[PDB]
């Protein structure tokens, strides 16, 4: 009558099903998130991820900074976030051109885990596609944070 | 992996085969000692380099030597 047990009836693996992971509220919520969605196209995945990140990478940068006390300059201090998401897109493309090397294809193991196919995000062109979507999404999210922070109304 | 060697000054006490924790050394028959058996090492690719065989060797100097070399996934003791 314990809430903790192994996964698939085989306990010799490291992942032991604990309440946190087992939790249906956690299971369905994680699946709903834009990265775990496999059928949706990679460009689409990258845009959603980039929008959320580009928007959250502005506030902590515009409130605490070198020009956080200058009124109009403080709004203009959010550009750095754009430079940050630019550095993030560059390192993401660098990881894609090296993770799934041309020599190493699938990398083996089809993976069962209930009737469903391998995510195309792990391909060579799929990571570049994701890198694109993340770049447009981050640039657009930073621009939305800057536009919304001046017409937010009673912020 | 590491290179293990067994010299002719072996007495065949079978202590290195008992001290090896990865089943690298074995005892083959010989005609040069009182025990008529000498150690060997066929599974050299499974050598990890813990040097327990050298501590188990009773003759002076050691009849078995573990010369460390290149490292692989098996010789580095990686479980991931």
């Amino acid at each position: 009558q314990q809430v903790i047990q192994p996964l698939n009836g085989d306990p010799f693996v490291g992942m032991l099903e604990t309440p946190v992971t087992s939790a249906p509220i956690v299971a369905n919520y994680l699946s709903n998130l834009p990265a775990y969605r496999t059928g949706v196209a990679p460009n689409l995945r990258g845009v959603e991820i980039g929008l959320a990140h580009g928007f959250l990478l502005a506030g902590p940068f515009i409130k605490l900074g070198p020009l956080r006390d200058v009124p109009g300059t403080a709004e203009v201090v959010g550009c750095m976030s754009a430079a940050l998401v630019l550095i993030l897109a560059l390192c993401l493309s660098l990881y894609g051109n090296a993770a799934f090397q041309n020599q190493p294809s699938m990398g083996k193991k089809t993976l069962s885990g209930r009737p469903l196919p391998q995510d195309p995000l792990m391909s060579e062109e799929g990571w570049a596609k994701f890198a694109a979507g993340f770049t447009v999404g981050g640039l657009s999210g930073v621009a939305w944070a800057y536009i919304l922070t001046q017409v937010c109304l009673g912020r | 992996a590491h290179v293990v060697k067994i010299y002719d000054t072996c007495i065949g006490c079978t202590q290195c085969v008992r001290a090896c924790p990865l089943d690298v050394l074995e005892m083959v028959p010989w005609d040069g000692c009182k025990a008529a058996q000498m150690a060997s090492s066929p599974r050299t690719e499974d050598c990890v380099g813990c040097k327990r065989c050298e501590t188990a060797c009773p003759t002076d100097f050691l009849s078995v030597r573990v010369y460390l070399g290149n490292e692989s996934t098996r010789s580095l003791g990686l479980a991931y």
Partner: protein, 147 residues
């Protein structure tokens, strides 16, 4: 099987971070490189020697250039006891209001740092007296480094 340690197939076939670190350690141990003869060893040493000479002459050329651009050499010659030598200028966007006001020394318009290498006394002793002789000699040292 990666290809970064080009001089060692053993480290090239390492599936861990040990390949990276060791790839920067045995990079000059030409005596223990894959497929190396005595003639190849001596020729490789003869090349690295020229590379060292080139970087040495380039370094001293850069010293002459920086002192000729921001150092107060002409001002130091007219008074070699009171004025202080200037190494180079300091450009730091991280500096504040008081750092810029306090780092300006030696009769300069911007923030600079005083030199402790003692090259001003050496150049003033050998004969360099103008701010142009250091310039022309710096380009000469860069030329000999290129050769």
């Amino acid at each position: 099987t990666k290809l970064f340690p080009k001089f060692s197939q053993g480290l090239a076939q390492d599936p861990s971070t040990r390949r990276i670190w060791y790839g920067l350690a045995t990079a000059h141990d030409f005596e223990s490189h894959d497929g190396m003869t005595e003639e190849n060893l001596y020729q490789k040493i003869f090349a690295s020697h020229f590379g060292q000479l080139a970087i040495i002459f380039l370094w001293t050329s850069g010293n002459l250039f920086h002192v000729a651009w921001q150092g107060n050499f002409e001002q130091w010659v007219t008074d070699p006891i009171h004025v202080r030598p200037i190494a180079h200028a300091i450009w730091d966007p991280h500096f504040g209001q008081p750092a810029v006001e306090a780092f300006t020394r030696g009769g300069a318009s911007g923030p600079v740092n005083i030199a402790t290498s003692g090259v001003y006394q050496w150049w003033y002793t050998i004969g360099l007296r103008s701010n142009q002789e250091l310039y022309v000699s710096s380009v000469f040292l860069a030329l000999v480094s290129a050769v």
